[PDB]
Nucleic acid binder design. Structure first.
Ligand SMILES: [Mg+2]
Ligand SMILES: [Mg+2]
Ligand SMILES: [Mg+2]
Ligand SMILES: [Mg+2]
Ligand SMILES: [Mg+2]
Ligand SMILES: [Mg+2]
Ligand SMILES: [Mg+2]
Length: 210
DNA sequence: CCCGGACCTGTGACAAATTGCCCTCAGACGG
DNA sequence: GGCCGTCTGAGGGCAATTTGTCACAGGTCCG
């Protein structure tokens, strides 16, 4: 199945995207890499890739597309808009989109890679972000270990404000996304908390491949 | 000493958002 | 050639779950 590769600068960028938007973004990066910024998406192909009906594919594409407007991306800093023209459909079942050509070099550069089947069943977009960050440190054989700082997790994934209270961070983000990865990818993930005084400062992740 | 206070933890409630489903009906095409 | 039957997909919606927010119980240490 398709092998996504991307510059680490994207793995570590600050942005806020939905699951459906992140799914489309993987195909754009794939289209661009296999070569102005003009990409295309077919309804019926999207449906087959992610096991959706044609109707629900159409709904997902259409709503993802109008929610890109005004979204912006920050590389740590420098901010860019994803799209520089609205999306549009020349033919029935077909969409044409205009990615910011100044984004091309951030996509293709020190890189991260995974096959698309590894991520296509994940539902929570923050769990997609976490699985991408871990892949960045994976070894050939399939294992790795990394310590991520909590403030940088909050900044980069643009987590919502109530997850600055640590018990809510644990309950609604960390535990849920470690559970998804363990249930929905071929990765097996564990972690431990690093402390300084009363405050928890980092999370230490270890993982292997099944 | 014990206080009120500034920190930290977890859980019960409720609000807001997202999920896969379901139904309608016109577009595109070919036999 | 041209209508119609079928495969699509662009709409309109739904209830069940998940995600996002905050009050209050209950621990520690400080001055
Ligand atoms: Mg969302
Ligand atoms: Mg949907
Ligand atoms: Mg403290
Ligand atoms: Mg004594
Ligand atoms: Mg008392
Ligand atoms: Mg009690
Ligand atoms: Mg008390």
């Amino acid at each position: 199945s398709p092998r996504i590769v991307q510059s680490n600068d994207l793995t570590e960028a600050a942005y806020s995207l939905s699951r459906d938007q992140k799914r489309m973004l993987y195909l754009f990066v794939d289209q661009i890499r296999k070569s102005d910024g003009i990409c295309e998406i077919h309804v019926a192909k999207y449906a087959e890739i992610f096991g959706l009906t044609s109707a629900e594919a159409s709904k997902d594409i259409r709503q993802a597309l109008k929610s890109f407007a005004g979204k912006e991306v920050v590389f740590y800093y420098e901010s860019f808009p994803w799209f520089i023209k609205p999306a549009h459909s020349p033919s029935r079942g077909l969409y044409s989109v205009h990615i910011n050509p100044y984004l091309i070099p951030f996509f293709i550069g020190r890189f991260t890679q995974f096959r698309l089947s590894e991520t296509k069943e994940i539902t929570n977009p923050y769990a997609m972000r976490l699985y991408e960050s871990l892949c960045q440190y994976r070894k050939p054989d399939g294992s790795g270990i990394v310590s991520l700082k909590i403030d940088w997790i909050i900044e980069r994934y643009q987590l919502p404000q109530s997850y600055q209270r640590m018990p809510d961070f644990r309950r609604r983000f960390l535990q849920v996304c470690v559970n998804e990865i363990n249930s929905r990818t071929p990765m097996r993930l564990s972690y431990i908390e690093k402390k300084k005084g009363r405050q928890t400062t980092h999370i230490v992740f270890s993982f292997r491949d099944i």
